[PDB]
Amino acid sequence: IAHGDGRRPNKQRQYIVMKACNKHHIGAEIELAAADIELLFAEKETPLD
Amino acid sequence: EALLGVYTNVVEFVKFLETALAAACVNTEFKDLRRMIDGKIQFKISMPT
Numbered sequence: 001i002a003h004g005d006g007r008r009p010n011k012q013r014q015y016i017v018m019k020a021c022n023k024h025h026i027g028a029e030i031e032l033a034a035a036d037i038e039l040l041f042a043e044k045e046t047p048l049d
Numbered sequence: 050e051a052l053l054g055v056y057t058n059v060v061e062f063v064k065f066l067e068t069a070l071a072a073a074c075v076n077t078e079f080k081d082l083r084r085m086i087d088g089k090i091q092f093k094i095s096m097p098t
Contacts, residue, residue, distance in 0.1 A: 033083070033084075034081075035081045035084040038081055039080060039081055039084075
């Protein structure tokens, strides 16, 4: 608050605070059959049934 | 002292579709056999009287 008329403040204070980031681990598992990966990627690029 | 010759086997094999055993079997090569688990072909066979 501004000065004057019987009002005496604890004039403007400034922190400088250093805080830390907190890491987190998230796991997941995808299983895929080897048949569908191979038939969807073939060296002969003719179309499929 | 001499080195009179240097020789080595070369292996050739008549593959399965060029032997005479394929006269006793039908050969239908499939793309990825890992896709199907069990073949369970059912037949309806009817006899005469």
